[PDB]
Amino acid sequence: VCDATCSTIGMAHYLTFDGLKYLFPGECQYVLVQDYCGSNPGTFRILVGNKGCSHPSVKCKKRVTILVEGGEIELFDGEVNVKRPMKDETHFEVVESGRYIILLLGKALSVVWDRHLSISVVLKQTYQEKVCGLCGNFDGIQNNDLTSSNLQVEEDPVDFGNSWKVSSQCADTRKVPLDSSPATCHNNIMKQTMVD
């Protein structure tokens, strides 16, 4: 079995490990992936947080707080910042090579960041159904990646990610009426072809 890879393709989309694109425009802070899931120790708690990102635009700068080995290293506005260094510094590593910030954290964890929006965490064979979050459980089964925090499969992803917000009193996002044309391309069929 190979090494899986989340992603954040654009402002509001998410590609799970097993492979499931879905739409979730949010504006609160959300658990992208973690290990403290049900009956496990809880080593790492990668999070993600967006501001002004329900409608994609030149707005929507992302913020990412990754919590491994009792640490707090986080990143936004181009650079990476350490708010609390972690104990076993041996595994830590930062490779600012090219357009990316490759960032190792252990034997079986890695993170990639294009300095703008993308978040591609890479995990190894070690876990195999030990994680959960917006990226799912990493089990091979591709249609159980919508198991919410309350331990049930949902069908509508906009109710899924609302289960994974950290602040349980911020605003949960709104069920958008479904359509093939977003706001600007709504009733602008000219522009909708120049984009296609």
């Binding site: 504006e27 501001k51 002004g52 009193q169 911020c170 605003a171």
Partner: protein
């Protein structure tokens, strides 16, 4: 003019409730407003706006006194025409 529900998070302004009292945070823009049950406006604002902001809550300077500088710019003794 359209009445919205609450909470609400558009345009980088999280309109929440904290401790049973309503809040309007704008940390991107540098302010935190709130109201209580009786009605008591409050505005927490970044040091940033030092020798800067000017309004009905005065300039964020040090001098407690000089902080009646009208919309023209005039130190007035009266706290009312200001």
């Amino acid at each position: 003019d359209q009445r919205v529900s609450m909470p609400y998070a558009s345009k980088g302004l999280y309109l929440e409730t904290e401790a049973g009292y309503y809040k309007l945070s704008g940390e991107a823009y540098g302010f935190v407003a709130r109201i209580d049950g009786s009605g008591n406006f409050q505005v927490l604002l970044s040091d940033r706006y030092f020798n800067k902001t000017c309004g009905l809550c005065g300039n964020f300077n040090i001098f407690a006194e000089d902080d009646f500088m009208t919309q023209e710019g005039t130190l007035t003794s009266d706290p009312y025409d200001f």
